[PDB]
Design a protein around this ligand. Structure first.
Ligand SMILES: [Cl-]
Ligand SMILES: [Cl-]
Length: 63
């Protein structure tokens, strides 16, 4: 549902591997592709790409 859309981190996360994106609570990311539990994303702040745990983020356009 979120490919191409903007999510915000609910919780911070420090990457443990090079393919992970590290982020802070409140950081905005574009979802590049969903792959189940982990999504590939781009930080709108740093422009870096990597995988993120989807249960750390929520859609920015919430009701
Ligand atoms: Cl990073
Ligand atoms: Cl940000």
């Amino acid at each position: 549902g979120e490919q191409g859309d903007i999510v915000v981190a609910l919780y911070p996360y420090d990457g443990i591997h090079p393919d992970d994106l590290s982020f802070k609570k409140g950081e905005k990311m574009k979802v590049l592709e969903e792959h189940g539990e982990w999504w590939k994303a781009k930080s709108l702040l740093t422009k870096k790409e990597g995988f993120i745990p989807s249960n750390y983020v929520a859609k920015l356009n919430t009701l």
